[PDB]
């Protein structure tokens, strides 16, 4: 019954389900390069410059059990995910507490309450109306029955002594739904992508409320057991990313974290067919605008929910961006049953905003002037990312380490939660190596036998050993000359050089800088290429051929073509 | 005259690329024969392109086709396969009325039900421009889109601009001659044939 099965699907749902259509190899041989490239781009496998390789990639993607499952389900009547333990919207109340500002300062305002139908609660929001603009003040300390202290969530311009304020005795709330995808907002829900401020349609949820019946419910979690596929050779081979855990992106300034973040967003939305939430904390306006524009251009904007706590906003507003992003991810998992990949940038700025709020409210600074509640706040942020029967919430968070000081209290707080650390090097980037991930310094907890095979572990261990040994021998080469090495040391050095250069990869997002098309490399292809290189099979090829390629065969083909041209030239 | 249909049909300078714009698969069969044995790389646009898409197994939606020559298209692709460059993106509308177009964002090859193909989309425009850039001869014949509609003639003007901005370009079709006259596309084309059946016979 095609009419009946199509009657349960919206037109947009059919448009999406056109992706999971099975193509026979007999048909696939008849396509052209242009159609094959369009199919690959639609399915997120990246461009291919060969015919048979493109057909093989499409067949490998199609022969996967998940793809076949989606294709088989796409020809059946719609089945609705029944939400167990959904997020309940806030309750409908009235403005029950009234008062006015009695003390002013920088970022902190005291409110005296005159007409109250109920006693004020911590963390509730007071709304003030100045020149037709609404300002939110979050409560921090309740001195007595009718006197509280508050800090601004946004801009404090226009507030003065005697400004009337009203409160519903509720914390701040934002409108969440599926319409949040493709829009850019701030932590409190103000529209940031157009001047007319077209509203977001959805229900009002309070991000500070966890809605747990009991504490024991927080222990009904499933420990991480799966590895997310990114398509990046170095990450897949050496630093597997947990699904349902946390990965930190560490480095100085300009190492290239944001490009990796954009690439991972694109790969998760296209290849993994999911929903992405971006939470910028202390996000620069120029970088936010640029990332929004490239999200629109590259085509992953309509499946991404952007929250931007800008760099110029008050510390109270900057602090809430992570919580709002976590709440959006929780809604997208619990209410809709979709796996979410949540991105955070930058965690250091979240810690700094917390320290600023602590210092403003007259609290005794901790060591190095940080807030006494540093570890508590970090845990509060990071403990809501987990993996439950409804789906997975994977987090990939970028951090800035000041002056490479890994013993800074913010970094020490962050490492307590990271499940895999990816450390970028400015020297390696300056050598032109991208994605400029340091393989020796970085490590992942998922590179064990509990999650990977024996072959993967052996390849990773041999690769790390070879890279460390060639790094040791390069100093000897530089000082005493390449002749001073032994016979085995020369082979080790050549294999290590080819391994190091084979790990570089062009991204589909980095086409703006170098103009080179990107590629998507499966885990099996990377493993086979590294296995070929480790054996010394490709030791007769100049090192310059190993840079910025996709698979092991491209180097061989390019070298063969160059040799043919050289033989023809003479 | 003979400097294009006869003199220029003997010893073309490689690379050679030809464009055939038409709304009938069974209206240019012979042309293909003499073209495939003369020119290697060919652009195809129009309703016959949708017939080719139906032959390949891709979805077609409510687009006009020619079900008689589906097997003919399969045969012309089986023998020679790395020759033709069919478009990927297709601007679609609900009916024949020239209304604001609608696109298939994901899986641009597939044409969903309730829509018919009339003009190629921006991705097809860009890939056709890329193919045009590396070329030495241009033989335009007919509109790849639907020129008679206001909201479906962007493809023809874009391809004309691509062919004129950058090797010898000419026109070998009556419909191409009409498009040139209505749009001013004689900047690069030396002359147009407007032979109709005569052009087909000279191209056969």
């Amino acid at each position: 019954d095609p009419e009946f099965v199509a009657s349960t699907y919206t037109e947009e749902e059919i448009i999406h389900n056109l992706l999971f259509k099975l193509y026979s190899v007999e048909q696939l041989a008849l396509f052209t390069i242009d159609q094959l490239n369009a199919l690959l781009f639609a399915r997120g496998l990246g461009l291919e410059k060969n015919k048979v390789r493109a057909i093989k990639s499409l067949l490998t993607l199609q022969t996967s059990y998940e793809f076949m499952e989606k294709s088989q389900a796409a020809l059946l009547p719609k089945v609705s995910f029944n939400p167990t333990n959904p997020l309940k919207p806030i309750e409908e109340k009235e403005f029950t507490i009234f008062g006015e500002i009695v003390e002013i300062r920088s970022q902190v305002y005291k409110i005296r309450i005159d007409k109250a139908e109920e006693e004020v609660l911590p963390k509730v929001i007071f709304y003030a109306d100045v020149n037709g603009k609404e300002i939110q003040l979050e409560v921090a300390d309740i001195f007595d029955k009718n006197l509280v202290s508050t800090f601004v969530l946004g801009n404090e311009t226009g507030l003065k002594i005697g400004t009337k304020v009203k409160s519903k005795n509720q914390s701040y709330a934002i409108k969440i739904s599926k319409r949040l995808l493709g829009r850019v907002i701030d932590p409190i829900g103000k529209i940031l992508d157009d001047s007319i401020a077209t509203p977001v349609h959805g229900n009002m949820y309070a991000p500070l409320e966890m809605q747990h019946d009991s504490e024991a419910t927080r222990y009904v979690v499933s420990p991480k057991n799966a590895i997310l596929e990114t398509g990046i050779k170095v990450i897949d081979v050496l630093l597997p990313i947990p699904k349902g855990g946390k990965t930190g992106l560490l480095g100085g300034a300009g190492v290239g974290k944001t490009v990796i973040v954009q690439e991972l967003i694109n790969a998760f939305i296209k290849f993994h067919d999911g929903v992405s939430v971006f939470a910028g904390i202390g996000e620069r306006i120029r970088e936010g605008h640029e990332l929004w524009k490239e999200a629109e251009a590259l085509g992953f904007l309509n499946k991404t929910a952007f929250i931007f706590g800008q760099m110029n906003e008050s510390p109270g507003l900057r602090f809430r961006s992570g919580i709002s992003g976590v709440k959006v991810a929780e809604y997208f998992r619990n209410n809709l049953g979709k796996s979410v990949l949540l991105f955070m940038d930058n965690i250091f700025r979240y810690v700094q905003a917390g320290s600023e709020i602590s210092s403003l409210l007259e609290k005794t600074p901790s060591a190095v002037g940080y807030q006494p509640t540093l570890f508590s706040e970090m845990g509060q942020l990071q403990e809501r990312i987990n993996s439950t029967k409804d789906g997975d919430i994977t987090s990939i968070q970028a951090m800035y380490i000041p002056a490479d000081d890994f013993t800074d209290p913010a970094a020490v707080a962050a490492f307590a939660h990271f499940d895999s650390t990816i450390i970028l090097s400015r020297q390696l980037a300056a050598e032109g190596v991208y994605p400029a991930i340091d393989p020796l310094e970085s490590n992942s907890k998922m590179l064990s036998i509990k999650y990977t095979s024996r072959e993967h572990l052996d390849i990773a261990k041999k690769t790390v050993q070879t890279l460390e040994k060639t790094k040791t021998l390069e100093d000897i080469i530089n000082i005493l000359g390449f002749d001073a090495l032994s016979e085995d040391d020369k082979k080790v050095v050549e294999v290590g050089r080819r391994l190091k250069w084979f790990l570089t990869q062009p991204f589909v997002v980095a086409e703006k800088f170098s103009g080179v098309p990107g590629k998507f490399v499966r885990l099996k292809d990377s493993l086979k290429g590294i296995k070929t290189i480790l054996d010394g099979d490709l030791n007769h090829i100049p090192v310059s051929y190993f840079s910025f390629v996709g698979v092991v065969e491209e180097i061989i083909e390019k070298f063969n073509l160059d040799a043919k041209k050289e033989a023809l030239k003479n | 005259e003979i400097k294009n249909l006869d003199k220029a049909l003997s010893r073309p300078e490689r690379p050679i690329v030809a464009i055939l714009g038409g709304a009938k698969v069974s209206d240019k069969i012979g042309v293909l024969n003499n073209l495939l044995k003369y020119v290697d790389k060919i652009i195809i646009g129009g309703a016959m392109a949708y017939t080719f898409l139906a032959a390949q197994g891709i979805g077609i939606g409510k687009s006009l086709v020619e079900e008689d020559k589906i097997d003919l298209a399969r045969e012309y692709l089986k023998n020679n396969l790395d020759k033709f460059v069919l478009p990927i993106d297709y601007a679609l509308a609900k009916d024949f009325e020239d209304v604001k177009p609608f696109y298939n964002l994901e899986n641009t090859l597939e044409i969903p039900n309730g829509y018919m193909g009339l003009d190629i989309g921006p991705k097809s425009i860009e890939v056709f421009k890329k193919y045009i850039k590396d070329a030495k001869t241009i033989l335009w014949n007919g509109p790849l889109g639907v020129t008679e509609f206001k909201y479906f003639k962007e493809g023809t003007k874009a391809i004309a601009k691509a062919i004129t901005e950058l090797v010898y370009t000419v026109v070998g079709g009556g419909d191409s001659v009409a498009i040139i006259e209505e749009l001013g596309l004689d900047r690069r084309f030396s002359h147009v044939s407007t032979g109709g059946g005569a052009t087909l016979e000279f191209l056969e």
Binding site: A29, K51, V52, I55 | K78, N79, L81
Partner: peptide, 5 residues
């Protein structure tokens, strides 16, 4: 050849 592909 078509079959080789």
């Amino acid at each position: 050849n078509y079959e080789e592909l």
